[PDB]
Amino acid sequence: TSIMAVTFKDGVILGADSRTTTGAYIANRVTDKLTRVHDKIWCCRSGSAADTQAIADIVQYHLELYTSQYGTPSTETAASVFKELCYENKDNLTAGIIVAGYDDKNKGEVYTIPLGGSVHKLPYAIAGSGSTFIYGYCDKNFRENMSKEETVDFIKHSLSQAIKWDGSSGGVIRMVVLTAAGVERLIFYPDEYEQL
């Protein structure tokens, strides 16, 4: 996988490739790695497909139950529930998860949860096998408070490169935009992003 989440002026954007792998065989070329755990709290999934799905399903369930009793959960709270699962089951899980959400108080937030189940709040986060190839690029090109169009471009260009060098990344680039205006799904096909 290649995944990332980026905070900006109006909120946060999540991005991902669409490749699922079964060895060197591409088991799914149109995977959706960006997943909803609440109206405006989403996650990017990397690692084991089974582990990350099982985790996201449980988290969605916890937050649905949270909502019923105490109203809308914060993005921090959602990240905490992911952590609890990842940390306590670290021996049996291969899950690299980025959590991203939009509050009206807190605006956009990104929490990354690597293999051991530690939590790290960041302006943006990258992860997955393909992310190694774009640490240089992303560190050089990210700024805070970018516009929506700048942030879409940053993600598009970054994942384009990750996909170019990483054989375990590919297909389409999916993105999910999280603002006060609601939730927007974007998709970009190879013929566009490849020749960037």
């Binding site: 699922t20 088991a27 799914n28 959706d32 084991s48 497909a49 089974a50 799905q53 099982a54």
Partner: protein
């Protein structure tokens, strides 16, 4: 095994070859890899033969009880969720690789489930040892907006690629068509392109050929 699922206009179709293997030996030339979970939700299974049958019946049983309890027709996503959570609990040790399809009040659906418990959504899918042969065909001929008859042809063509090119697949093609608003039609041995040729000779023996030591009547009665 080769198995596939293909969506179309007004429903979904699944297909499977009919070979069972124990190592290089063909254990069964005509087993049914298409399973009924509920009347309009069917399952194609690859992997450990007993696991796909057992996991399919268990969830089929619970779906029936659930359908009765709720006074509703069962949904594919319920079979999907129950299957995946069961398989995940068993950490891959239950070797069932499934293409789940069906129609329900929500519409028509097509999914795959791998043994560790991950699920996928698609318009065309293939699993099993013959999945690459089948997927080559699907990637070559699939299009958006297939008719029922195009979808059936595409599915059985994909299974045929497996039958001819994969040593793990052979014999016949089974199909099941689940169209919205209609009964599922299960087409057992839809294609039979591997009919054994007439043998050269009859090996029926002269009676008395076999040397016998003893006879006796067995008591099956009370």
């Amino acid at each position: 095994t080769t198995i596939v699922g293909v969506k179309f206009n007004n429903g979904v179709v699944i297909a499977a070859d009919t070979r069972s293997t124990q190592g290089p030996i063909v254990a069964d030339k005509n087993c049914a890899k298409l399973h009924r979970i509920s009347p309009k939700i069917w399952c194609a299974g690859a992997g450990t033969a007993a696991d796909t049958e057992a996991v399919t019946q268990l969830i089929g049983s619970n779906i029936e009880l659930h359908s009765l309890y709720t006074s509703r027709e069962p949904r594919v996503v319920s079979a999907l969720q129950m299957l995946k959570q069961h398989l995940f609990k068993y950490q891959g040790h239950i070797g069932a690789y499934l293409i789940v399809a069906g129609v329900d009040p929500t519409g028509s659906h097509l999914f795959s489930i791998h043994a560790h418990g991950s699920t996928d959504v698609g318009y065309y899918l293939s699993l099993g040892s013959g999945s690459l042969a089948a997927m080559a065909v699907l990637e070559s001929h699939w299009k958006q907006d297939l008719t029922k008859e195009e979808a059936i042809k595409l599915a059985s063509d994909a299974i045929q690629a497996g039958i001819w090119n994969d040593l793990g697949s052979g014999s016949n093609v089974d199909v099941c068509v689940m169209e919205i608003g209609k009964d599922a039609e299960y087409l057992r041995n839809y294609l039979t392109p591997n009919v054994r040729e007439e043998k050269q000779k009859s090996y029926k023996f002269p009676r008395g050929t076999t040397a016998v030591l003893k006879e006796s009547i067995v008591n099956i009665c009370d």
